[PDB]
Structure 1
């Protein structure tokens, strides 16, 4: 219980749309996974969760990622919701690998397993067509998807906007039960 993960990518594509996306989808992430509207003590028991943020590789001189949410005491994540950065493709795969390694570290040392689930959020239809020339990972977004879903039993998900990206077709490789068929027009489900 109280397990979530956020991955924001649609900065340039959903700059203004991010407010409505939060008002319609980010509220149940706290309303359902907690008692209600969030100051509480922060522990390492597993009740905490993570949140990763990634930007466009093109509109970036040298920096890649700025992930910061080890525990967040389930409120510090609510603190830096509006503390996002803004920047055409996006090449988000290099940022999905960050969440991959993060949940790998979680399963490696933070194992008390609460089967922490992960959710991705994008507005542009990204693709890191060059999957090479990286630091500690040389896989594509489909390989990352099948590794995070098939190899790792971590529940994957991607909350797309009203439009139709390609990830809605890439969902077909989600071998574990993701429950991404019905859209969350009512309160969001723990497994999207």
Structure 2
């Protein structure tokens, strides 16, 4: 139960803004599943989640993914990745991470092998720069596109997925509602933390 996924990618595009968003959207979201971030035992408790933030090909010709957050007790490594994510990312502003979200799908896969005995799987991804790229994975067997990623995240599994970007709105939300299963990308609002994004 309560199988959530936390993703952010705008580190290269916009770092400080995330720090602001953390003060209003990221931190309250975690409190929905914990009595308060302190330092506790970690195991297969259902309510665990991951923390995935990477960069683009601009100044990283030797690294795309280094995620590691199986349980983290939802407090310690969560707060760590929040406050110690990154400060890099240059090049230009055309695309930061699309191939990342595909890997995110792969993460859900391991839940099928780990969360045996449903769980109403949920996921959330953040990215300031509007992404677009030809490559798909370059890391694993699975391959596709942004369209393939979203149809997998919606149809293949009923994972509720939203994108709480900065107050600005790019040309992304439009295509991300072409899924017959309700995407529910609504939680991009200055109002307080939604119950389940």
State the TM-score, normalizing by the size of structure 2.
0.85
Q: Which moved more, 1:87-96 or 1:45-54?
A: 87-96
Q: Which moved more, 1:87-96 or 1:52-61?
A: 87-96
Change (3 A) 1:92 1:144: same
Shift in Å, 1:108:
2.5
* Preserved CA contact (<8 Å) 1:157 1:180: yes
Shift in Å, 1:39:
1.2
C-alpha distance in structure 2 between counterparts of 1:106 and 1:39, whole Å: 24
Shift in Å, 1:161:
1.1
* Preserved CA contact (<8 Å) 2:2 2:47: yes
Where 2:6 maps in the other structure, the secondary structure is strand
Shift in Å, 1:64:
0.9
Shift in Å, 1:85:
4.8
Deviations 1:52-87 (A, max 9, x none): 222112321211101111000111233323454547
C-alpha distance in structure 2 between counterparts of 1:16 and 1:34, whole Å: 25
Shift in Å, 1:125:
0.7
Q: Which moved more, 1:152-161 or 1:80-89?
A: 80-89
C-alpha distance in structure 2 between counterparts of 1:132 and 1:6, whole Å: 19
Change (3 A) 1:183 1:134: closer
State the TM-score, normalizing by the size of structure 1.
0.87
Deviations 1:20-67 (A, max 9, x none): 011111122222222234311111131211122221123212111011
Shift in Å, 1:183:
3.6
* Preserved CA contact (<8 Å) 1:157 1:178: yes
Unpaired runs of 5+ in structure 2? 88-92
Q: Which moved more, 1:133-142 or 1:41-50?
A: 133-142
* Preserved CA contact (<8 Å) 1:57 1:90: no
Residue-pair matches, total: 192
Aligned-residue Cα RMSD (Å) equals 2.3
Unpaired runs of 5+ in structure 1? none
Shift in Å, 1:124:
0.6
Change (3 A) 1:166 1:134: farther
C-alpha distance in structure 1 between counterparts of 2:132 and 2:182, whole Å: 24
Change (3 A) 1:190 1:104: farther
